[PDB]
Design a protein around this ligand. Structure first.
Ligand code: MG
Lengths: 255, 247
């Protein structure tokens, strides 16, 4: 109520995930190392709400999931829970596991799970077909939203997909493995759309499934949620989110 | 929420809510996608509930002359209700007064007209002609978005168009011909499914959500948000849209 963001210094959790965030590893310092759709949103928020900020990456370079053996979180989620950060500023997918531990901002983008495949010859219509064949290998990135949704899906065949697939380290590794061929990568629509635009030998496996949002992550009881929510809604209503997606997402296709 | 009683603001808006005006008692007068959501929430969280309609039968908007709200929004601000359970569109004006739950459906503004082969390509072209009339429903979200749009030609559309009482009046006027009705995609999709001579004018514009409305500092927001997100994740929202929307 009384608290606002004027004069505050926010620590923002993030990682590279194009086109939401690009992180330069040399030739820059501090916030200047960061660019992308989410960075543009943060810059505007900082101008309008009067805060300064820095970005903090999790050492494990994970987005975050709950380990059912240890009951501990990792990734950006863990950094937020541990008060290393105040908000997670990225394409953070909405899922129930995360919601049990953190809050979400007003959302900025609808997204679904999308599976893609590289390979000549017989192909697949739906991801569960992977379980009854051995032509294609497949995988999801560990400690990231798609893995969590497949593991919590009430049809435990989706947990089989996760358990019997390759555990991929991060998006670069997943895309490298996909490009190696005879592989199905199961991830998120907007991420794949942007990053695989030139991969003319990569095709869809069925339709997108599951419905969720990208939002920012906020700790429970954050004094800043109301303001962030209001301002993100205004961004959406004013067309800013759409303008930034057009700015940053890849256009055309050589294909 | 276990043991609690929630007063829920709502009105008829098919296929989200159907209200029977006779032949029923209490909660059983209501049905539809939103009712099915409320029933499941009630079972899972353990609250009882009733529905309360605003006397003015409006969704609600802020009158910039009086700086007062009407409709379901006003009933919530007046503490006549605890939550608004309907397809409540997200807009900044409402956000200045109330909170929203986690959303359950994307929606856009859509314009429609009767008669094949309309010559209109975009709604602002209406300002430069007088073959067609047009309008929006008063004290409802599309009116608010057009009035608050950066491009004040959208305010012109509202000010120079017909103020429609409600969805029935609007569809009636649409079906009467030579009239462009500007409203919300999902509502129009459902309610005009059988109108095979009604057509879109331009593309949908504006991006918003349907959510429930909550008073600021509600003690119930966290739980409602969590359970609505779980409904989306489990596929329940999509199953209900398939159940209720035509067809
Ligand atoms: Mg949405």
């Amino acid at each position: 109520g009384s608290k606002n963001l004027i004069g505050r210094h926010l620590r923002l959790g993030s990682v590279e995930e194009q086109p939401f965030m690009f992180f330069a590893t040399e030739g820059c310092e501090g916030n200047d190392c960061w660019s992308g759709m989410v960075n543009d949103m943060v810059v505007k928020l900082s101008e309008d709400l009067g805060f300064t900020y820095e970005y903090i990456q999790p050492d494990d370079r994970k987005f975050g999931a709950l380990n059912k053996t240890t009951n501990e979180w990792n990734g950006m989620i863990r950094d937020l829970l541990d008060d290393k950060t105040d908000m997670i500023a990225i394409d953070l997918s909405t899922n129930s596991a995360r919601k049990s531990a953190i809050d979400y901002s007003f959302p900025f983008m609808d997204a679904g799970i999308k599976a893609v495949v590289k390979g000549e010859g017989t192909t697949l219509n739906q991801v569960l077909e992977l379980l009854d064949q051995d032509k294609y290998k497949w995988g999801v990135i560990g400690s990231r939203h798609p893995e969590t949704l497949l593991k919590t899906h009430r049809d435990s065949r989706y947990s089989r997909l996760v358990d019997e697939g390759v555990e991929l380290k991060d998006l670069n590794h997943a895309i490298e493995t996909l490009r190696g061929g005879l592989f199905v990568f199961i991830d998120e629509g907007p991420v794949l759309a942007h990053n695989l635009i030139s991969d003319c030998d990569v095709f869809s496996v069925g339709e997108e499934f599951q419905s969720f949002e990208y939002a920012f992550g906020l700790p429970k009881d954050s004094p800043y949620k109301s303001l962030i929510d209001s301002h993100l809604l205004k961004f959406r209503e004013e067309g800013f989110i759409d303008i930034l997606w057009e700015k940053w997402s890849s256009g055309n296709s050589v294909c």
